[PDB]
Design an enzyme around this catalytic site. Structure first.
Site, short mmCIF file in Angstrom:
data_model
loop_
_atom_site.label_atom_id
_atom_site.label_comp_id
_atom_site.label_asym_id
_atom_site.label_seq_id
_atom_site.Cartn_x
_atom_site.Cartn_y
_atom_site.Cartn_z
CB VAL A 27 -92.57 36.67 -23.19
CG1 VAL A 27 -93.93 36.58 -22.50
CG2 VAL A 27 -92.76 36.44 -24.70
CD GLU A 28 -91.79 35.73 -17.58
OE1 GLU A 28 -92.19 36.57 -16.76
OE2 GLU A 28 -92.40 34.68 -17.80
CB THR A 29 -88.33 41.75 -17.93
OG1 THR A 29 -87.15 41.17 -18.52
CG2 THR A 29 -88.71 40.94 -16.69
#
Ligand SMILES: N[C@H](CCC(=O)O)C(=O)O
Ligand SMILES: N[C@H](CCC(=O)O)C(=O)O
Ligand SMILES: [Ca+2]
Length: 314
Positions: free
Chosen positions: A114-116
């Protein structure tokens, strides 16, 4: 040979006549032994990014399918397949993180996803520009970001990095897990074992996310959330809510899975288009929100991790 430049007390650039930048330099020199002229050279290159200020303002504090729209941004065939590749590629680090911190691979894989998107989207903004802009030209959160800038510069100095070469988000978040400077300081670990903490090394990031989770209370083997049968339209919902299991039962809910020893839970409500889907939020779900304060974020991280775990089994 040596040029002290004691007489060079005025820097150029976007923060040239900024009182906040001057006070910040004084703090770094007095508190951390930084050389004023060296710091002036660095900050003279720092850029004031209005886009950063605008985004920070745009984020200042149905049923129509809200959850469905958020979910489909993260849980897609391409994303799940890439998650499987990341998991298999770093299975040893993930297993080791499970053993040391008690945080399962699906959670760490979901967070980094989800972050990167597992290192594919780590940010394009120079951290120094973002942090200087927020510290020197944004009164509302100037103190928080000045603290982040201070830590960022100390991090660069210690890890011997050039502060100007590091890039990330508009808020100054870095690497695979999008760690803020303060998170690097309090939670990042050298999980690869080479003696250096690199937020851009997937092995270090995996261990750092796990440590972050354990530090924030992650309970090994405990349930994250349990979907409920029934509706509870009268009760306020959100990851910050708290109700005893008895109250929720009285409101018309029953757990789809045994809650075990849990006597309370948060009331989560997901907009699935055709109506609402209620869930009993358990402590571990709240721990996920400690990474990003959002019900949708935490649910997407968890479900993305589960989707990858399943795609691996095939
Ligand atoms: N993102 C934080 C939210 C603060 C809060 O509501 O806790 C801010 O912009 O200040
Ligand atoms: N993506 C969120 C909205 C989606 C949601 O959390 O419902 C935003 O940028 O505001
Ligand atoms: Ca390392």
């Amino acid at each position: 040979m040596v040029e002290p430049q004691h007489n060079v007390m005025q820097m150029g650039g976007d923060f040239a006549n900024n009182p906040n930048a001057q006070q910040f330099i004084d703090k770094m020199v007095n508190k951390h032994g930084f050389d004023r002229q060296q710091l002036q050279e660095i900050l003279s290159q720092a850029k004031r990014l209005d886009s950063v200020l605008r985004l920070m303002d745009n984020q200042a504090p149905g049923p129509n399918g809200a959850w469905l729209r958020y979910r489909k941004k993260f849980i897609t065939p391409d994303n799940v397949q890439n998650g499987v590749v990341f998991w298999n590629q770093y299975e040893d680090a993930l297993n080791r993180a499970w053993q040391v911190y008690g945080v399962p691979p699906e959670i760490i894989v979901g967070i980094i996803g989800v972050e990167t998107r597992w290192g594919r989207v780590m940010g394009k903004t120079r951290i120094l520009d973002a942090l200087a802009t927020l510290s020197f030209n944004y009164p509302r959160r100037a103190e928080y970001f000045s603290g982040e800038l201070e830590t960022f510069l100390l991090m660069a100095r210690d890890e011997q990095d050039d502060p100007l070469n590091l890039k990330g988000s508009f808020a100054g978040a870095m690497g695979y897990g999008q760690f803020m400077p303060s998170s690097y300081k309090q939670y990042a670990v050298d999980f690869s074992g080479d003696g250096h903490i690199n937020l851009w090394d997937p092995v270090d990031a995996i261990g750092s996310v796990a440590n972050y989770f354990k530090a924030h209370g992650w309970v090994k083997g405990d349930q994250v959330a349990v979907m409920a049968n029934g509706q509870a339209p009268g009760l306020p919902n959100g990851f910050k809510t708290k109700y005893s299991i008895s109250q929720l039962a009285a409101a018309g809910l029953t757990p789809q899975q045994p809650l075990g020893n849990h006597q309370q839970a948060s009331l989560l409500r997901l907009d699935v288009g055709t109506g609402y889907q209620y869930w009993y939020g358990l402590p571990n779900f709240y721990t996920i929100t400690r990474y990003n304060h959002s019900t949708h974020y935490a649910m997407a991280v968890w479900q993305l991790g589960q989707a990858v775990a399943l795609a691996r089994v095939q």
